[PDB]
């Protein structure tokens, strides 16, 4: 009930600054004046087919938790973003009989329809050596390749699978389950 007037607010006091060294040698303030421009050596990493993970011979479809279905395939978008290569695993562990897919044999316009206007999606068309772009389902692919890499993504506005520059980026993944 009693209201005692408190004083105005001010900044807490601060210690004074330390003195600034004039006796510095300058030669030791910087380093040795001779400098070499930096050079980097990136560890090349060849990409082979995972073999451990491949096209499943089984049929399944989690009818209650699939992203979108079309004809004889069910399509899931991984909720957690993953690496491009690691998604080979990420599709198998998601649901039974699910695997990394290459979209154009199914026609990707539907996939690109079910995306936002900024979100990307790793897709499963690759090239092991310097040959054709292929998927686990096989065949050849037209690809908008602009980088040397082997990985590919799609976006809302994508017309064709697009090669990516760094396959270590985290993005969701397109996984498929068969019904045949």
């Amino acid at each position, epitope marked *: 009930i009693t209201w005692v007037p408190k004083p105005n607010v001010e900044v807490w006091p601060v210690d004074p600054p330390p003195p600034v060294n004039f006796n510095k040698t300058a030669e030791q303030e910087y380093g040795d004046k001779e400098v070499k421009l930096p050079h980097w050596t990136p560890t090349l990493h060849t990409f082979q087919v995972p073999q451990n993970y491949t096209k499943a011979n089984c049929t399944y479809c989690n*009818t209650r938790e699939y992203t979108f279905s079309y004809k004889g395939c069910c399509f899931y978008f991984t909720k957690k973003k993953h690496t491009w290569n690691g998604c080979f695993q990420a599709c198998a562990e998601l649901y039974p009989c699910t695997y990394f897919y290459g979209p154009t044999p199914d026609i990707l316009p*539907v996939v690109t329809r079910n995306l936002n206007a900024i979100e990307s999606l790793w897709v499963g068309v690759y090239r092991v050596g310097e040959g054709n772009w292929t998927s686990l389902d096989g065949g050849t692919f037209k690809v908008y390749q602009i980088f040397g890499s082997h990985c590919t993504y799609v976006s809302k506005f994508s017309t064709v699978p697009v090669s990516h520059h760094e396959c270590s980026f985290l993005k969701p993944c397109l996984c498929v389950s068969q019904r045949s």
Partner: antibody, heavy 120, light 106 residues
């Protein structure tokens, strides 16, 4: 030669439990690329798919809305057959029951189908 | 989800018969056509819109587009008088057709 035949009691009293079993031959109940479905046909309800079961990594069972809390479909790997149980049956359940093979979309090969009537 | 097929269709013996099945984006799904002759168990006559099971007359054919799926029987001979049902799978539901009774005139 893929074939399968139904069997079980054809008469069930009101409330009560309905039990049926379909024995298959020419294929495996543990098939990796199939599903085993129970489907009933009645003039009142048309052609309604009751349920299905399959085996991949584990045994999975899928059921329809009209009998979600009442249906159970259990297989048997030994006799290569699969059963169907429907508790709390009503006169609406009077129908001809078939079993069939399928692949999630289509239902390939059907059973002979047995008529189940309810009237106490 | 809503499979609408004509209650009855008629055709003269020899002329091509057409049975239709409508629904929202049925062209995005795999339509199956089953034939049930009177007093018989349903038998798959067409699957995957156009694919035919082994041992089905080539007169039976199927198409799927947008909101219409058509099952065309070119021969229309004997034994074709039956009830034809379309079947699709919208999410967690197998939707069967109401039923199209085929009448073989002539």
């Amino acid at each position: 030669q893929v074939q399968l035949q139904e069997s079980g009691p054809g008469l069930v009293k009101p409330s009560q439990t309905l039990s049926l079993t379909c024995a298959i031959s020419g294929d495996s109940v543990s098939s990796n690329s199939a599903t085993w479905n129970w489907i009933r046909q009645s003039p009142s309800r048309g052609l309604e798919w009751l349920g299905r079961t399959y085996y991949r990594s584990k045994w999975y069972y899928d059921y329809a809305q009209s009998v979600q809390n009442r249906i159970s479909i259990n297989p048997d790997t030994s006799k290569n057959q699969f059963s169907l149980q429907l508790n709390s049956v009503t006169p609406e359940d009077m129908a001809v029951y078939y079993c069939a093979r399928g692949d999630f979309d289509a239902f390939d090969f059907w059973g002979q189908g047995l008529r189940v009537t309810v009237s106490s | 989800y809503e499979l609408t097929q004509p209650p009855s269709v008629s055709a003269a013996s020899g002329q091509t018969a057409r049975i239709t099945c409508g629904g929202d984006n049925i062209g995005s799904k795999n339509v199956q056509w089953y034939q049930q002759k009177p007093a018989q168990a349903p038998v798959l006559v067409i699957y995957a819109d156009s694919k035919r099971p082994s041992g089905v007359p080539e007169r039976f054919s199927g198409s799927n587009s947008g909101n219409t799926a058509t099952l065309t029987i070119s021969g229309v001979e004997a034994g074709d008088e039956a009830d034809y049902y379309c079947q699709v799978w919208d999410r967690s539901s197998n939707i069967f057709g109401v039923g199209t009774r085929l009448t073989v005139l002539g």
